[PDB]
Amino acid sequence: KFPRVKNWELGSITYDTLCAQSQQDGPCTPRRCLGSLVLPRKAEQLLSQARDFINQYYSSIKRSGSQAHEERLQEVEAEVASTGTYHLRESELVFGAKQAWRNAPRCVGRIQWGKLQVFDARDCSSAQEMFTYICNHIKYATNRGNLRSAITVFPQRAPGRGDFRIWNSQLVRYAGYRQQDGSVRGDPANVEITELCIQHGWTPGNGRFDVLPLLLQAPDEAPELFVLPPELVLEVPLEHPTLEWFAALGLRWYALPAVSNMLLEIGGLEFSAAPFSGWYMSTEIGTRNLCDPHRYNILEDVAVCMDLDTRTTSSLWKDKAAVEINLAVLHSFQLAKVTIVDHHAATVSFMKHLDNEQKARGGCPADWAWIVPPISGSLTPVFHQEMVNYILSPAFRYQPDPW
Amino acid sequence: GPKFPRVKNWELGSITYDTLCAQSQQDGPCTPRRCLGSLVLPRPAEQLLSQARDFINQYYSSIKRSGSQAHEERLQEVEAEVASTGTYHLRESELVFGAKQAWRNAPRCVGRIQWGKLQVFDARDCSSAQEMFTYICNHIKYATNRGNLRSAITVFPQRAPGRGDFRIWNSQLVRYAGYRQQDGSVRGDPANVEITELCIQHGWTPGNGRFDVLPLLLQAPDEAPELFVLPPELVLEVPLEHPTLEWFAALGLRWYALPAVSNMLLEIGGLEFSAAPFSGWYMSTEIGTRNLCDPHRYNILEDVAVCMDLDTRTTSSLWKDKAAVEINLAVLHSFQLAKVTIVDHHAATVSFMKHLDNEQKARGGCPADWAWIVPPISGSLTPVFHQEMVNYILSPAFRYQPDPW
Ligand code: HEM
Numbered sequence A: 001k002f003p004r005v006k007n008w009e010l011g012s013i014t015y016d017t018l019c020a021q022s023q024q025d026g027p028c029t030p031r032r033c034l035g036s037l038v039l040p041r042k043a044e045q046l047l048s049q050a051r052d053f054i055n056q057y058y059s060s061i062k063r064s065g066s067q068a069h070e071e072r073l074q075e076v077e078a079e080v081a082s083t084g085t086y087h088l089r090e091s092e093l094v095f096g097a098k099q100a101w102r103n104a105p106r107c108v109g110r111i112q113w114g115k116l117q118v119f120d121a122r123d124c125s126s127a128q129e130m131f132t133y134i135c136n137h138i139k140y141a142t143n144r145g146n147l148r149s150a151i152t153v154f155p156q157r158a159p160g161r162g163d164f165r166i167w168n169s170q171l172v173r174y175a176g177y178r179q180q181d182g183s184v185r186g187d188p189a190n191v192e193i194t195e196l197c198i199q200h201g202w203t204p205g206n207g208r209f210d211v212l213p214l215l216l217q218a219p220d221e222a223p224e225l226f227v228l229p230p231e232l233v234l235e236v237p238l239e240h241p242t243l244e245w246f247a248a249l250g251l252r253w254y255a256l257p258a259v260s261n262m263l264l265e266i267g268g269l270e271f272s273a274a275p276f277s278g279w280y281m282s283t284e285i286g287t288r289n290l291c292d293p294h295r296y297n298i299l300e301d302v303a304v305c306m307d308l309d310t311r312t313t314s315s316l317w318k319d320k321a322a323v324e325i326n327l328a329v330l331h332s333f334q335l336a337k338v339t340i341v342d343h344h345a346a347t348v349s350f351m352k353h354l355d356n357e358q359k360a361r362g363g364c365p366a367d368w369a370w371i372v373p374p375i376s377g378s379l380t381p382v383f384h385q386e387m388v389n390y391i392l393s394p395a396f397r398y399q400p401d402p403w
Numbered sequence B: 001g002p003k004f005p006r007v008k009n010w011e012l013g014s015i016t017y018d019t020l021c022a023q024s025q026q027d028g029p030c031t032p033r034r035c036l037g038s039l040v041l042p043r044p045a046e047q048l049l050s051q052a053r054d055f056i057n058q059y060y061s062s063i064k065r066s067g068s069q070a071h072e073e074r075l076q077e078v079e080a081e082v083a084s085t086g087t088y089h090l091r092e093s094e095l096v097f098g099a100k101q102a103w104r105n106a107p108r109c110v111g112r113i114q115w116g117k118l119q120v121f122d123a124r125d126c127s128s129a130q131e132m133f134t135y136i137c138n139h140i141k142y143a144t145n146r147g148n149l150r151s152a153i154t155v156f157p158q159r160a161p162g163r164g165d166f167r168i169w170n171s172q173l174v175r176y177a178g179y180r181q182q183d184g185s186v187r188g189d190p191a192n193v194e195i196t197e198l199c200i201q202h203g204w205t206p207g208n209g210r211f212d213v214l215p216l217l218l219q220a221p222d223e224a225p226e227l228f229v230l231p232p233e234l235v236l237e238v239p240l241e242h243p244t245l246e247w248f249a250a251l252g253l254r255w256y257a258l259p260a261v262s263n264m265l266l267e268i269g270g271l272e273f274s275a276a277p278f279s280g281w282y283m284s285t286e287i288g289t290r291n292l293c294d295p296h297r298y299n300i301l302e303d304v305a306v307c308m309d310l311d312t313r314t315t316s317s318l319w320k321d322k323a324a325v326e327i328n329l330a331v332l333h334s335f336q337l338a339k340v341t342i343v344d345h346h347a348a349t350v351s352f353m354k355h356l357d358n359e360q361k362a363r364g365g366c367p368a369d370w371a372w373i374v375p376p377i378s379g380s381l382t383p384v385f386h387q388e389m390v391n392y393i394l395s396p397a398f399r400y401q402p403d404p405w
């Protein structure tokens, strides 16, 4: 029937009835679970999604059945029947953006979901205008290190017309230059975007942390290249509270995590450019970005500096170096007065969020493999909590690369 | 592309397709509408015969005699036996193949690289609780081997029509007592509170330590379980010390050498073996992270962090992470010093990636439960974190079964 959901540390049980509201298939079947896969393998419809969303909106303002609610439904209907599409009012877009964050199964930061600044950028007609909105978004969100969550929404997709797109996967990305002796200098995750930039006329650097320009694209136009003003990109030098040699590693990370390659779907409408930002959880930087073998891969370097036995796995040299790197990220962001949350505090807030949502909506869609942090899993409460994963709309979705 | 799940490793960029999942004949808990992958326990002769035939086919394939005269004859013999008695019996070599294949098929086990080297003790002649005990002690002595641990399974008689099961009530052959206290706390292992109280109900005189080895409650068919004390010399333990933190030894922590699971059901060709205890050797995180640091287990994290003089008043000091690493190191160092087989989570996961490649070639895939395969500390520092996995049920299988009481 409905999933019985148990927490194995406390022995407490809930039941998810929210999943019954899902209208979209995930990748699992009774024959086999594909829950660990990162990406998906691959007018009456629009109208029914539209109506459902308008229903969500009016219920949320506690005015279901009001004349305003009936009129709005007819507007949507008349617009679709005539034009094949429709448009949201700003207040609907604001509600929609918040629900999409709220519904995002892979996000451990959802306790913050109702606090989101929404910039309406739907009156955008050029890449140059896109750039101006983006600079303002960054300036607002960064806020001298007192980070504020925000989203900017660019014009929706229209049939038989190219999309508005930001080609970069994030607003801030460090270059990855592939030197022909096999290796990569910089961030291996951004090799393809770096090359795309150079090809579109960017003068490349040759450092480990060169901030990339943005490639911005208006419909059916070649993308345009814009360099972000260095004073807009707040960055944090990494040092360690006790290990003085750590700063000599020349490591740093940027303050603002702003994803810019995802599609925002609201009521059947699709926003192909809608970058969103919040603040970092430390493990993203300290564990994944710096310690992944296919990223900066600094584990061995830090270990050799800590004079650890690199010869055998059984000395746990990797685990020790990783802890210290995460410590340095936390220490450095704290010294710089830049908002950051550690994985213990984040997962503790998520448990509170699960409980809030259980009372509010009867469940919470969550992807266990993503919610549990990449170091010290079972040391956090979420490890011991069963979760149900399913797709609710409004939603953030992946979409193909524009190139 | 091919019409099978596509499986990617995000570290290496390499891609495989799982075709083995096509052979699954039993559903798990997921649907296209919602994934239940994270749940720990998810919820007639014609039915027996098809399970039986499938297994005999599997057996004859494994010896490259599929379609042979002996194959058709063994099939014919299984149908005849089921037809006249409602059940059938496995030849010795079929039981051995079945036991190894159940291990090979176990989605939650990271140690499967070793699957082909499993010593199978045939105990289907056992007729008493006392005899079960003799078999179990023999298993323990062989598997323990003075610290040079050897994988083994002992198989007691199958479930039979209208007759009680053979059962071992304890969840493992070695378990530390958990004594419920007057204030509500637990002395010992909280995981074992219930089995401890059952032992006392059945006549065990209880100790009062943190590490009292429990007696075994053993049940022969249609009889009350009998109580058996393991002679201490048979139960190898390892006192825990740390290679540099000299005070760690003073904590008086220890763990037993042999992980031997005893409450699972071994299913083969529809036959059900309700008592089939199996053992290997530990991965160090099972002891160092889960058993010692889980909040609902021994919960020693704060004790150790205080000894290490860490800031336990704030999450951002990473005092939990720091203490947990040193505890795992102590586990590894103590087992190594004691010459008792053990594998760290890095070596174990590397060996499992090797296993995945072997099985891709041998069977076109490998059923695996990501959440269980990725270790409870240092997750993304191990190669399995970045490997997509397909989970599904194959038979022969080890299955959960309800508690006997
Ligand atoms: C405010 C503090 C926030 C924290 C601490 C946080 C934390 C996280 C973390 C750790 C991840 C995993 C990312 C990865 O491993 O690659 C994630 C993913 C995600 N977050 Fe949040 N987040 C925050 C704000 C937001 C906001 C404002 C939004 C949208 C409005 C959002 C939506 C998402 C989405 C859609 C993903 C999945 C990304 C993907 O699948 O590629 N988050 N978050």
Ligand code: HEM
Residues within 6 Å of the ligand: B099, B103, B106, B108, B109, B110, B111, B112, B114, B118, B151, B152, B153, B278, B279, B280, B281, B282, B283, B286, B343, B348, B372, B398
């Ligand atoms: C040889 C060394 C072995 C190692 C290092 C190993 C490792 C592990 C680990 C770390 C787990 C996770 C347990 C947990 O978190 O509760 C596990 C589970 C499991 N193992 Fe292995 N194992 C080994 C041998 C065996 C053998 C010999 C068998 C059977 C013949 C086996 C069958 C299983 C099964 C069925 C589970 C799942 C149990 C459950 O879900 O309660 N393993 N193993």
Ligand SMILES: Cc1cc(N)nc(CCc2cncc(CCCN(C)C)c2)c1
Residues within 6 Å of the ligand: A038, A257, A258, A259, A276, A277, A278, A279, A280, A281, A284, A288
């Ligand atoms: C709003 C927000 C806040 C935050 N702390 N992290 C994020 C995600 C940032 C992030 C971190 N590592 C990696 C990625 C890339 C993910 C790519 N997808 C396709 C798996 C993104 C977003």
Ligand SMILES: Cc1cc(N)nc(CCc2cncc(CCCN(C)C)c2)c1
Residues within 6 Å of the ligand: B040, B111, B259, B260, B261, B278, B279, B280, B281, B282, B283, B286
């Ligand atoms: C053969 C074998 C080897 C090994 N290293 N571990 C095991 C599992 C032992 C084990 C460890 N922690 C916890 C448990 C309890 C299992 C809980 N199941 C029933 C959900 C069992 C078995």
Ligand SMILES: C[C@H](O)[C@H](O)[C@H]1CNc2nc(N)[nH]c(=O)c2N1
Residues within 6 Å of the ligand: A036, A037, A038, A369, A370, A371, B010, B385, B386, B387, B388, B389
């Ligand atoms: C294969 C596996 O699904 C994949 O590597 C996932 C695991 N969990 C994750 N969790 C987070 N937060 N971010 C990730 O990129 C991943 N990667």
Ligand SMILES: C[C@H](O)[C@H](O)[C@H]1CNc2nc(N)[nH]c(=O)c2N1
Residues within 6 Å of the ligand: A008, A383, A384, A385, A386, A387, B038, B039, B040, B371, B372, B373
């Ligand atoms: C809720 C979650 O499924 C549960 O805590 C699981 C997670 N992964 C695990 N993995 C292993 N090896 N052992 C476990 O007990 C668990 N517990």
Ligand SMILES: [Cl-]
Residues within 6 Å of the ligand: A257, A284, A289
């Ligand atoms: Cl990032």
Ligand SMILES: [Cl-]
Residues within 6 Å of the ligand: B259, B286, B291
């Ligand atoms: Cl154990």
Ligand SMILES: [Zn+2]
Residues within 6 Å of the ligand: A028, A032, A033, A034, A035, B030, B034, B035, B036, B037
């Ligand atoms: Zn699933």
